[PDB]
Design an enzyme around this catalytic site. Structure first.
Site, PDB file in Angstrom:
ATOM      1  N   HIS A  61      12.750  -2.110  -1.828  1.00 14.54           N
ATOM      2  CA  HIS A  61      12.156  -0.855  -2.268  1.00 14.54           C
ATOM      3  C   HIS A  61      10.924  -0.476  -1.463  1.00 14.54           C
ATOM      4  CE1 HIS A  61       8.803  -2.966  -4.289  1.00 14.54           C
ATOM      5  NE2 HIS A  61       9.716  -3.903  -4.471  1.00 14.54           N
ATOM      6  N   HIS A  91       0.393  -2.819   1.181  1.00 13.96           N
ATOM      7  CA  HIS A  91       1.659  -2.103   1.258  1.00 13.96           C
ATOM      8  C   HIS A  91       1.382  -0.626   1.012  1.00 13.96           C
ATOM      9  CE1 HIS A  91       1.477  -3.022  -3.151  1.00 13.96           C
ATOM     10  NE2 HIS A  91       1.773  -1.735  -3.175  1.00 13.96           N
ATOM     11  N   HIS A  93       3.036   3.323  -0.563  1.00 10.25           N
ATOM     12  CA  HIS A  93       4.013   4.121  -1.282  1.00 10.25           C
ATOM     13  C   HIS A  93       4.112   5.483  -0.617  1.00 10.25           C
ATOM     14  CE1 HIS A  93       4.026   1.396  -4.871  1.00 10.25           C
ATOM     15  NE2 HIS A  93       2.841   1.117  -4.357  1.00 10.25           N
ATOM     16  N   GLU A 103       0.720   7.780  -5.332  1.00 13.36           N
ATOM     17  CA  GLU A 103       0.903   7.399  -6.724  1.00 13.36           C
ATOM     18  C   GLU A 103      -0.187   8.015  -7.589  1.00 13.36           C
ATOM     19  OE1 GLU A 103       3.854   4.053  -7.210  1.00 13.36           O
ATOM     20  OE2 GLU A 103       1.937   3.057  -6.768  1.00 13.36           O
ATOM     21  N   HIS A 116      -2.138   0.536  -0.676  1.00 15.62           N
ATOM     22  CA  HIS A 116      -2.620  -0.401  -1.691  1.00 15.62           C
ATOM     23  C   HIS A 116      -3.004  -1.702  -1.014  1.00 15.62           C
ATOM     24  CE1 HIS A 116      -0.348   1.785  -5.156  1.00 15.62           C
ATOM     25  NE2 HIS A 116      -1.490   2.366  -4.828  1.00 15.62           N
ATOM     26  N   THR A 196       2.001  -0.822 -10.483  1.00  9.29           N
ATOM     27  CA  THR A 196       2.701   0.455 -10.566  1.00  9.29           C
ATOM     28  C   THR A 196       4.214   0.315 -10.516  1.00  9.29           C
ATOM     29  OG1 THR A 196       2.634   0.935  -8.198  1.00  9.29           O
ATOM     30  CG2 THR A 196       0.728   1.613  -9.535  1.00  9.29           C
TER      31      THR A 196
HETATM   32  N1  LIG Z   1       1.852  -1.193  -6.431  1.00 15.61           N
HETATM   33  S1  LIG Z   1       0.685  -2.292  -6.941  1.00 15.61           S
HETATM   34  O1  LIG Z   1       0.260  -1.853  -8.443  1.00 15.61           O
HETATM   35  O2  LIG Z   1      -0.549  -2.369  -5.889  1.00 15.61           O
HETATM   36  C1  LIG Z   1       1.457  -3.912  -7.127  1.00 15.61           C
HETATM   37  C2  LIG Z   1       2.713  -4.025  -7.713  1.00 15.61           C
HETATM   38  C3  LIG Z   1       3.287  -5.280  -7.903  1.00 15.61           C
HETATM   39  C4  LIG Z   1       2.604  -6.417  -7.489  1.00 15.61           C
HETATM   40  N2  LIG Z   1       3.205  -7.723  -7.760  1.00 15.61           N
HETATM   41  C5  LIG Z   1       2.621  -9.021  -7.408  1.00 15.61           C
HETATM   42  O3  LIG Z   1       1.632  -9.136  -6.768  1.00 15.61           O
HETATM   43  N3  LIG Z   1       3.305 -10.238  -7.809  1.00 15.61           N
HETATM   44  C6  LIG Z   1       4.514 -10.159  -8.601  1.00 15.61           C
HETATM   45  C7  LIG Z   1       4.118 -10.517 -10.035  1.00 15.61           C
HETATM   46  N4  LIG Z   1       3.289 -11.722 -10.067  1.00 15.61           N
HETATM   47  C8  LIG Z   1       3.985 -12.896  -9.560  1.00 15.61           C
HETATM   48  C9  LIG Z   1       4.891 -13.599 -10.581  1.00 15.61           C
HETATM   49  C10 LIG Z   1       5.544 -12.922 -11.604  1.00 15.61           C
HETATM   50  C11 LIG Z   1       6.356 -13.604 -12.493  1.00 15.61           C
HETATM   51  C12 LIG Z   1       6.520 -14.971 -12.342  1.00 15.61           C
HETATM   52 BR1  LIG Z   1       7.649 -15.991 -13.533  1.00 15.61          BR
HETATM   53  C13 LIG Z   1       5.889 -15.642 -11.320  1.00 15.61           C
HETATM   54  C14 LIG Z   1       5.076 -14.961 -10.449  1.00 15.61           C
HETATM   55  O4  LIG Z   1       4.446 -15.664  -9.424  1.00 15.61           O
HETATM   56  C15 LIG Z   1       1.335  -6.291  -6.935  1.00 15.61           C
HETATM   57  C16 LIG Z   1       0.758  -5.041  -6.745  1.00 15.61           C
HETATM   58 ZN   LIG Z   2       1.489  -0.426  -4.694  1.00 20.83          ZN
END
Ligand SMILES: NS(=O)(=O)c1ccc(NC(=O)NCCNCc2ccc(Br)cc2O)cc1
Ligand SMILES: [Zn+2]
Length: 257
Positions: A61, A91, A93, A103, A116, A196
């Site tokens: 995505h 990254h 959007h 966003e 971001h 987001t």
């Molecule tokens: N567009 S944004 O708002 O800037 C944005 C959006 C998404 C992210 N996602 C992120 O960083 N990591 C994924 C979730 N955390 C890890 C995790 C999840 C579940 C389990 Br189980 C184990 C894990 O290690 C960061 C910034």
């Molecule tokens: Zn983002």
């Protein structure tokens, strides 16, 4: 699996992720007549080491530029924070055409894309995985990208995309300091919000810069020519990946200026 199309997109995320309808969701429209200037907000301080740049990945995505996060070589401090936050990724959007794609919006105005720069609270937590679901766990700088002149600071990023055209491809991406992408002024808005996209954790202190950065129509086209399919399948361009703005639900957007 979630995405941005009509069947799996933002309006359907609530079925698997009920937090999508929560009280601290992002992004938001920043109404400047309703922001609160907070004299206690300190300037934002970023200090990033280019040697922490690691890898660029097509995640289907979007694409992500990830950073080594084993120490405090690359950190964000100041603003509303008393803790130091460790850089882990940047990254973007973007939208289907130039008229939308950011966003966050400001006074209803949609920009063409949004950068971001994401960090996690290493003062309190031991890893991104621990920090990501905590209310004070993440700090993300958002920069609105206004279509106009080509932005030469994006060159390394854009040049890398030809090697990660399809989902799952990855490549080394080294010796890069993403503070070069930030606007000249770091005046900002801040509010408590969320990731987001799924899992949509309400764990992000958002730092939205007042000043935009530029991006050309052709640079945006490079983003949209990334492919969401795996190699060998029918090509499916990444046309857009911006979530609609969400209700403030009584939150206050503070201004540093
Ligand atoms: N567009 S944004 O708002 O800037 C944005 C959006 C998404 C992210 N996602 C992120 O960083 N990591 C994924 C979730 N955390 C890890 C995790 C999840 C579940 C389990 Br189980 C184990 C894990 O290690 C960061 C910034
Ligand atoms: Zn983002």
């Amino acid at each position: 699996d979630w995405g941005y199309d009509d069947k799996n997109g933002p309006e359907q995320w609530s079925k698997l992720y009920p937090i999508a309808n929560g009280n601290n969701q992002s992004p938001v429209d920043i109404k400047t007549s309703e922001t609160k200037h907070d004299t206690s907000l300190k300037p934002i301080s970023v200090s990033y080491n280019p040697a922490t740049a690691k890898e660029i990945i097509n995640v289907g995505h979007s694409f992500h530029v990830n950073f080594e996060d084993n120490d405090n070589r690359s950190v964000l401090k100041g603003g509303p924070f008393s803790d130091s936050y460790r850089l882990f990724q940047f990254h973007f959007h973007w939208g289907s055409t130039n008229e939308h794609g950011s966003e966050h919006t400001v006074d209803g105005v949609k920009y063409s894309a949004e950068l971001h720069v994401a960090h996690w609270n290493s003062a309190k937590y031991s890893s991104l995985a621990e920090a990501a679901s905590k209310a004070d766990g993440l700090a993300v700088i958002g920069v609105l990208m206004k279509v106009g002149e080509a932005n030469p600071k994006l060159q390394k990023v854009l040049d890398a995309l030809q090697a990660i055209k399809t989902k799952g491809k990855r490549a080394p991406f080294t010796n890069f300091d993403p503070s070069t992408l930030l606007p000249s002024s770091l005046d900002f808005w801040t509010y408590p919000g969320s990731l987001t996209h799924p899992p949509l954790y309400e764990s992000v202190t958002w730092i939205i810069c007042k000043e935009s950065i530029s991006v050309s129509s052709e640079q945006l086209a490079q983003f949209r020519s990334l492919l969401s399919n795996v190699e060998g399948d029918n090509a499916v361009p990444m046309q857009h990946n911006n979530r609609p703005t969400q209700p403030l639900k009584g939150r206050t957007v503070r201004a540093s200026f």
